[PDB]
Amino acid sequence: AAQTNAPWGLARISSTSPGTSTYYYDESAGQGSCVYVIDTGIEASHPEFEGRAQMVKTYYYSSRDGNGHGTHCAGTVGSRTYGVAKKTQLFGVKVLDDNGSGQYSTIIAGMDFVASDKNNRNCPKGVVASLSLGGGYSSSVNSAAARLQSSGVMVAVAAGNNNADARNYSPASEPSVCTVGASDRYDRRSSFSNYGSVLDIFGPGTSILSTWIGGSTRSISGTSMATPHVAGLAAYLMTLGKTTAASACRYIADTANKGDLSNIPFGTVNLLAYNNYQA
């Protein structure tokens, strides 16, 4: 299935080269998979979600996304126009307030929530969680991400936007989850993207068009934007069978475009998420 004039990041994920604008993907499109977006929430009413999104948890006075960030990330995972996995089910977990902030204790509670909550959902092809958030190193935050992964969820987390080694950030520094750096449309490491040994993969992160609150759309940049490309990719590959929650990060690394990114520091993987779809 070809989507013409797709956002550059979608086109990139199904291409052996930069500079194209059509996204190619198997029509199964993540059907039967689920992706949790642990963030500021998701505007489920957005026409782009087609009824496939819903809020399942909040730690605040509302489950509404009053920020937009969570809605944008969810759109990159699974919206009809802006999403990687256009038929996945999206579950919003609001651990961040409308200012985009959240206490680590609330974020941890949200991760443990997902590990249990998946047992209340129908996800026969598998379960993914996208965590476009982070802060300074915390063993407790890392451990929560590790538990979520251990429980049978493909956990994708943002490397961070500090142009620094991600070893000093959490959950980025957790070895057992999939830590995602950001690239731009010219295959350069995004200027803000963290790097380091803890990174597992890069995805499109600069100038990413997706859904926004109030039924709108906008382009923003961050490792927050790269992460949902990888989460959506995992969901897509899981419905194809190709991989499982426990092996998806390795599989994505195995099958990535290799050595094609510029300004990757010595010691950081040079791997760009790729669906290996042959139309």
136 near Ca ion (CB under 5 A): no
10 Å Cβ neighbour count for 237? Answer: 28
Q: Minimal CB distance to Ca ion: which residue? A: 175
Shortest distance, CB of residue 133 to Ca ion, whole angstroms? 18
175 near Ca ion (CB under 5 A): yes
SS3 content of the chain, % helix, strand, coil (to 5): 25, 25, 50
Any binding-site annotation on 177? yes
Query: How far apart (Å, rounded) are the C-alpha atoms in residues 187 and 151?
Result: 34
Active site residue 69: yes
Active site residue 224: yes
| Segment contacting Ca ion by CB under 5 A, of 21-29, 120-128, 186-194, 195-203 | 195-203
Q: Of residues 15, 39, 98, 132, which has the active-site annotation?
A: 39
Phi then psi for 245, rounded to 5 degrees? Answer: -55, -40
Nearer to Ca ion, 162 or 207 (CB): 162
Nearer to Ca ion, 123 or 271 (CB): 271
- Cis bond leading into 171, ω under 30°? yes
267 near Ca ion (CB under 5 A): no
Active site residue 170: no
* Tokens 């992460």 sit on residue: 227
Query: How far apart (Å, rounded) are the C-alpha atoms in residues 96 and 52?
Result: 22
Q: Of residues 33, 65, 69, 132, which has the active-site annotation?
A: 69
Q: Are 231 and 149 in contact (CB under 8 A)?
A: no
Binding residues for Ca ion, rule: CB under 5 A, are: 175, 200
Cite the active site residues: 39, 69, 224
Binding residues for Ca(2+): 16, 175, 177, 200, 260
